[PDB]
From a paper:
Of these are a class of multi-protein ABC toxin complexes (Tcs) that have multiple receptor binding domains on the shell of the A subunit (TcA) for recognizing and binding target cells. The Xenorhabdus nematophilus TcA, XptA2, has thus far only displayed toxicity to insects. Here we report the high-resolution structure of the Xenorhabdus nematophilus TcA XptA2 by X-ray crystallography and cryo-EM, each at 3.1 Å resolution. XptA2 forms a 17.5-nm-wide, 24-nm-long pentamer with a molecular mass of ~1.4 megadaltons (MDa).
To generate a structure in the absence of crystal packing, we next solved the pre-pore structure of XptA2 using single particle cryo-EM, which yielded a map at 3.1 Å resolution. The cryo-EM and X-ray structures exhibit 5-fold internal symmetry comprising five protomers that assemble as a pentamer. XptA2 shares the conserved α-helical translocation channel that is less than 1 nm in diameter, housed within a balloon-shaped outer shell. The remaining β-sheets are composed of three IgG-like receptor binding domains (RBDs) that may play a role in cell surface receptor recognition and targeting. Both structures reveal that the RBDs are like sockets in grooves with only modest contact with the main XptA2 shell. The central translocation channel is formed by five extended α-helices per protomer for 25 α-helices. The XptA2 linker is disordered and “loose” in the pre-pore state between the translocation channel and the outer shell, like the TcdA1 linker. The unknown density most likely represents a counter-ion deriving from the crystallization conditions due to the absence of this ion in the cryo-EM structure.
Numbering used by the authors:
A (entry chain B): 294 to 586
B (entry chain A): 1807 to 2002
C (entry chain A): 50 to 293
D (entry chain C): 2198 to 2246
E (entry chain A): 880 to 1074
F (entry chain B), H (entry chain C): 2100 to 2148
G (entry chain B): 929 to 1025
The structure:
């Protein structure tokens, strides 16, 4: 289940569908081909409060949402994708949204096949009053689909590599994602795996830290009983809220700025540096932008 | 049934394993019973167990495990089987604690026999298909009454009009495995790992 | 009543009888002396694969789990009071009815103080109609209680400073920066004094504004004659009689 | 006669249980001696270092 | 700045907070609420994980006390008079006076709350309890249903009686079976002795 | 070289302490098992007789 | 010493590889075997043991025949000749085992 | 010369440890023989009587 998630075989109506992945074989209905897909979720801020589950379901060329709630509310919800942007609406859940009840969402539309790979399908802009709405949580959803034989071959590759090297399925997935979009295994990926093992043995680092050292991004996948590396760095414990990469906006790391930002403070605390050292790191890495942002 | 079982239990407590085996073979023997120079066709040598004869019609009038097993003498079959497994595991541990090569081989033999009598242990089946309900949804008197009416009708008849029960209307809890048997399997796994 | 009790007992016996034979752990050299009953087949054909959905002990789905115990407790104690009474379970705790019986709820560790704080916060914001942040801002200036005013950012700053440098040794050894601080501000560092508590402590009291100050500093249901009883003062300020 | 038989049976069972507890205390003493021997075997390695 | 694990701008901001009695003199200079929040975030950014957890525990305890006092002073339920933290405990079925160190789970705390409520209702401590409801089989067997362990034992006895079968004792054992047990209750049992 | 041998000597002392603790723990489990069992079935039978 | 350690590691790896190859490519006349444990019960010798435990050929043959006899007597392997399983040697199996 | 005497002293300590281990091993053998023998023929005869 670490590799495959939960197979869709007609369970009960709610039952969730993520362990924290979902997959099944589905015969495409526009022609006579049988494919297999897989959707992986990274939970997004304020998900453990409200939302029993928030699942992205795939039906062959179009996707919808299945949602359950912790608390009862008498109003509706809008599933957005942007930070309350004009073009952020991608679907709606019609209420009243009672707790512990399944709710389907109307064949989400405003999302492209390009962003369906590493694209946030989620924004639970749920209405608590007639004019008050809040972000009640969600997750970033990544979708892959292959013919069944190609899926089996890729699973063969991944399982053999994980078994022989000792890396976790999610660690290998992050390594291959930080190397190419197609998630193929080549000399570059094998070299990164070697350097991961070597750095872990040499500097007495965890596999996540060695993976970051090798050139990969910080891992955000959680295993439904553990904490992701990003969350362990930046949200254990949270300052007062959750800092997430699902922000995409510009924060100024100029030390000389009056009225600093919560994002800057959380980044400083996660990296274990002060404002001047964070400015030094920004200059050294060259991630700096205009206005020292 | 009750006298050979008590004699077996006392001999096992005193560690007279061969005599205990002789006394428990009057009730159950995995190798059968020799009657008139041939293997008998019955599995259990205790006739009331072989025929599952209930002789207690009011078992729940008091908290009494023996009364329950008298109402359903299947539990007596399970109890005798578990007593036999306990005897085998005690024999294996007693052989193991001698540390000689022949003693270790004897321990391996006893553990393998216990494993072959137990079989292959099952997995968790219904946990991930369970839809977690609300507290009020689980305590729903309507759900409880529907299940109880189905049970009452099943206790006499078997009418299954609209056979499938429309799984979406389940807020009931699921049966649980036996911790004693899982403990047997865990012990055997640990002992075989250490021996190997 | 007696027939209802006997039927309940019979159904319990039948369910146990079915599950005993359906158990996969007896599959099994003991399975040779096991027979499938017609009632077992009927139960299977009615309820699907329920009879074979055995779960491992420690799962929330089990019938002997804490979820099952809580279901029984709630089912029987739901009606211990009339829905009119304020002591009704669903009147004093409306979240119990909507509590979800899931494995994460059964296993995940959390602090009793966190749960109690979220319950109290829910009740307070239900009463006031505002947000948690609005409640905190209001508490920062609320005076008509003994544990208030509660300036949460101020207390966080004070605790951070006390963690980093207790006894103010670093500040004492650097007189250039210690001289720029006011005495009352340093008192706020050394002891819990919010800006509003400082205003309370340093506001001047005259006979003209005595009544307005009393109305501002005390609840509406408190009159200056309430200070003629020492037991009331002890109860209000949370002191013992000797302390008063 | 029933009372006398009960008294004899009780005496027999009491003596048997006394013997059992005495064997348990002997087992504890045996374990203590074995632990002492092992501890001395380790002290020997310390002393030769 | 190094001692407080922060920067001289933050130190200057902390120093600029002056208590000057807010009149009776020129004036006092205090930050706004949002400026206080920004200063708190900046100051808390310098702590490690352990110190952050300790600070969170202290904040939880202080908020518990403040919220309990606010509730006691401002909210009175329908027909319930509650005058203390212990009254709040017995009303909301959760202890607000516990430390931040002790932990639990949601289901365990719900179980404890309902157990406390049932005890208070049955022992006539809370008025108007429905006496007809208090005579059910659950509350009649409340001597074993008041704890999860005893409830689980009496519930499992129906489904796995073989775990509690004892070959040497049983309700309804005959006198001759007792005599046989006494006859073989020694420690050195031979085959001839058992026969 | 001599100082390295001294380090080895303190390691051997740690090993001796490990054996001592193993013996003490065995005693603890033995006496806890005696205490929890209390009056066994034979002694109870004799008293009832 | 290092050569002996290398030989032990090689023996363990070869045992696993050969067992997997046998399972995936060879099936006997009418026996369905699906595991290393099935291979153990069939070939009457443990392939899951370590290289540390040692034995002799006669001792291993004795253990294998004892395992086979236990499996045949307890009706675990089907089609066992019940007339043969009533001899004196197997009637006294409580002391001959 | 003095350092040679120190070496002789630690040898004497090794000999003391040897005597201590001899006593411990004697105790272990005695208690093992008592434990394995358990209930002897005289006690068994008395209980049967």
């Amino acid at each position: 289940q670490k590799y495959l998630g939960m197979l869709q075989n007609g369970y009960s109506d709610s039952t969730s569908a993520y362990v924290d992945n979902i997959s099944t074989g589905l015969v495409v209905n526009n022609e006579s081909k049988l494919e297999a897909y897989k959707i992986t979720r990274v939970k997004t801020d304020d998900y453990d409060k409200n939302i029993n589950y928030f699942d992205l379901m795939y039906e062959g060329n179009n996707q919808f949402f299945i949602r359950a709630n912790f608390k009862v509310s008498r109003e509706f919800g809008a599933t957005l994708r942007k930070n309350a942007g004009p073009s952020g609406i991608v679907g709606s859940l019609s209420g009243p949204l009672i707790a512990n009840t399944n709710f389907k969402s109307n064949y989400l539309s405003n999302i492209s096949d390009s962003e369906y790979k590493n694209g946030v399908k989620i924004y639970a802009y749920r209405y608590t009053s007639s004019t008050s709405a809040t972000n009640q949580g969600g997750g970033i959803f990544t979708f892959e689909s292959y013919p069944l034989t190609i899926f089996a071959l890729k699973l063969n590759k991944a399982i053999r590599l994980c078994l022989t090297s000792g890396l976790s399925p999610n660690e290998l997935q992050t390594i291959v994602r930080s190397d190419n979009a197609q998630g193929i295994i080549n000399d570059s990926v094998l070299t990164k795996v070697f350097y991961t093992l070597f750095y872990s043995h040499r500097y007495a680092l965890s596999f996540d830290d060695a993976q970051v050292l090798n050139g990969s991004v910080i891992n955000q996948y959680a295993d439904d009983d553990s904490v992701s590396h990003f969350n362990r760095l930046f949200n254990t414990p949270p300052l007062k809220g959750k800092i997430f990469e699902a922000d995409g906006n510009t924060v100024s790391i100029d030390p000389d700025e009056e009225q600093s930002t919560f994002a800057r403070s959380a980044l400083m605390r996660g990296l274990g540096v002060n404002s001047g050292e964070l400015y030094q790191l920004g200059k050294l890495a060259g991630v700096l932008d205009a206005q020292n942002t | 049934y009750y006298t050979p079982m008590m004699c077996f239990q006392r001999l096992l407590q005193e560690k007279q394993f061969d005599e205990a085996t002789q006394w428990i073979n009057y009730v159950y023997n995995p190798a059968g019973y020799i009657v008139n120079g041939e293997i008998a066709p019955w599995i259990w040598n205790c006739r009331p167990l072989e025929e599952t004869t209930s002789w207690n019609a009011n078992p729940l009038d008091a908290i009494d495990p023996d009364a329950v097993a008298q109402n359903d003498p299947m539990h007596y079959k399970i109890a005798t089987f578990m007593r036999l497994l306990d005897q085998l595991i005690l024999r294996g541990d007693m052989a193991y604690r001698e540390l000689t090569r022949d003693a270790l081989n004897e321990a391996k033999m006893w553990y393998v026999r216990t494993l072959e009598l137990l079989g292959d242990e099952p997995e968790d089946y219904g946990s991930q298909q369970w839809a977690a309900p609300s507290l009020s949804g689980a305590a729903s008197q309507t759900v409880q009454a529907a299940y109880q009416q189905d049970l009452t009708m099943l206790g006499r008849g078997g009418v299954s009009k609209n056979l499938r029960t429309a799984n979406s209307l389940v807020g009931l809890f699921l049966p649980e495995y036996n911790p004693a048997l899982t403990d047997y399997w865990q012990t055997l796994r640990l002992r075989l790992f250490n021996l190997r | 009543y007696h027939e209802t009790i006997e039927q309940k007992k019979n159904n319990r016996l039948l369910e146990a009888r079915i599950f005993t034979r359906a158990n996969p752990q007896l599959s099994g050299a003991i399975r040779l002396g096991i027979e499938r009953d017609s009632v077992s087949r009927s139960y299977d054909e009615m309820f699907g694969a329920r009879s074979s959905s055995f779960v491992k002990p420690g799962s929330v789905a089990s019938m002997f789990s804490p979820a099952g115990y809580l279901t029984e407790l709630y089912r029987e104690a739901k009606d211990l009071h009339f829905s009119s009474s304020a002591y009704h379970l669903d009147n004093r705790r409306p979240d119990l009815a909507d509590l979800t019986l899931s494995q994460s709820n059964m296993d995940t560790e959390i602090s009793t103080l966190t749960l109690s704080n979220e319950l109290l916060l829910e009740h307070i914001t239900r009463k006031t109609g505002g947000d948690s942040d609005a409640l905190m801002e209001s508490l920062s200036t609320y005076r008509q209680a003994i544990d208030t005013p509660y300036h949460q950012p101020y207390e966080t700053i004070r605790q951070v400073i006390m963690t980093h440098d207790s006894t103010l040794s670093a500040l004492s050894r650097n007189p250039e920066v210690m001289g720029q601080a006011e005495g009352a501000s340093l008192l706020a560092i050394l002891a819990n004094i919010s800006p509003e508590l400082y205003n309370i402590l340093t506001e001047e009291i005259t006979e003209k504004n005595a009544d307005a100050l009393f109305a501002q500093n005390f609840s509406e249901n408190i009159t200056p004659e309430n200070f003629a009883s020492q037991s009331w003062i002890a109860k209000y300020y949370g002191l013992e009689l000797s302390e008063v | 006669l029933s009372a006398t038989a009960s008294q004899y049976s009780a005496d027999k069972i009491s003596r048997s249980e006394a013997y059992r507890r005495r064997r348990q205390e002997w087992e504890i003493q045996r374990d203590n001696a074995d632990g002492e021997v092992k501890q001395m075997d380790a002290q020997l390695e310390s002393l030769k270092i | 700045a190094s001692a407080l694990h922060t920067m001289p701008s933050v130190i200057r901001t902390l120093v600029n907070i002056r208590y000057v009695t807010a009149l009776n003199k020129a004036e006092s200079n205090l930050p706004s609420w949002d400026e206080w929040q920004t200063l708190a975030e900046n100051m808390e950014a310098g702590l490690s994980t352990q110190q952050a957890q300790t600070l969170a525990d202290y904040t939880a305890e202080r908020l518990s006390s403040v919220l309990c006092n606010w509730f006691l002073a401002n909210i009175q339920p329908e027909g319930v008079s509650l005058h203390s933290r212990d009254d709040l405990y017995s009303y909301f079925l959760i202890d607000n006076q516990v430390s931040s160190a002790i932990k639990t789970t949601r289901l365990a705390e719900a179980i404890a709350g309902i157990q406390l409520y049932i005890n208070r209702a049955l022992n006539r401590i809370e008025p108007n309890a429905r006496a007809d409801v208090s005579t059910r089989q659950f509350f009649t067997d409340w001597t074993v249903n008041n704890r999860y362990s005893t409830w689980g034992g009496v519930s499992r006895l129906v489904y796995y009686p073989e775990n509690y079968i004892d070959p040497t004792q049983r309700i309804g054992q005959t006198r001759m079976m007792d005599e046989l047990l006494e006859n073989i209750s020694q420690s050195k049992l031979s085959r001839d002795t058992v026969e | 070289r001599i100082q390295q041998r001294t380090v080895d000597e303190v390691d051997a002392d740690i090993a001796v302490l490990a054996e001592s603790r193993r013996s003490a723990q065995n005693r603890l489990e033995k006496y806890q098992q005696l205490y929890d069992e209390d009056i066994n079935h034979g002694e109870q039978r004799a008293m009832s007789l």
